Amino acid sequence: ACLEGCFCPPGLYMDERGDCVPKAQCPCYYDGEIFQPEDIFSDHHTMCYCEDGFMHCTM
Amino acid sequence: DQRVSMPYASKGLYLETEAGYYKLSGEAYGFVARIDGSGNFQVLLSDRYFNKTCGLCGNFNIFAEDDFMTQEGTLTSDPYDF
Numbered sequence: 430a431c432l433e434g435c436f437c438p439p440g441l442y443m444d445e446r447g448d449c450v451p452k453a454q455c456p457c458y459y460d461g462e463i464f465q466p467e468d469i470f471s472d473h474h475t476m477c478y479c480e481d482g483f484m485h486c487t488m
Numbered sequence: 489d490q491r492v493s494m495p496y497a498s499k500g501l502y503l504e505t506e507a508g509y510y511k512l513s514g515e516a517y518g519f520v521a522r523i524d525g526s527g528n529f530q531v532l533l534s535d536r537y538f539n540k541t542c543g544l545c546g547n548f549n550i551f552a553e554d555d556f557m558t559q560e561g562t563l564t565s566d567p568y569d570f
């Protein structure tokens with residue numbers, strides 16, 4: 430719905446640590462794992478990275 | 489970081505100008521680079537590195553479809569993330 434509470438402007442999205450931040454340093458939550466904004470990441474067979482909040486996996 | 493004059497020939501790398509366009513030769517190390525006035529990098533390279541040099545200009549093989557083998561070594565469909 431259209432709820433009531435404490436938000437912050439649209440350019441800013443919420444961080445875990447009480448502040449809200451732009452989507453530049455908005456981490457990824459891949460498989461639960463809280464990856465930092467720049468974490469290149471791969472097993473032998475996959476290839477994955479966190480860009481701006483979304484987790485860009487390939488194969 | 490020290491700006492040198494031109495031409496220049498240290499360490500087996502003659503740094504010359506040919507046809508009004510700049511050249512960098514490494515015939516001992518098997519390559520010849522150059523640039524034009526507009527700016528168009530070019531790299532001539534021997535047959536010694538056939539199926540060797542893997543990078544941004546791809547391998548020196550015969551094929552042309554398989555010459556995206558990443559720094560891991562992975563045939564990719566995208567010419568961009570490569």
Ligand SMILES: *[C@@H]1O[C@H](CO)[C@@H](O)[C@H](O)[C@H]1NC(C)=O
Nearest residue numbers: 538539540547548549550551
């Ligand atoms: C290139 O070298 C690789 C690795 O040794 C080998 O697997 C492949 O068969 C070679 N390809 C050609 C065209 O020689």
Ligand SMILES: [Ca+2]
Nearest residue numbers: 547549551555
């Ligand atoms: Ca090739």
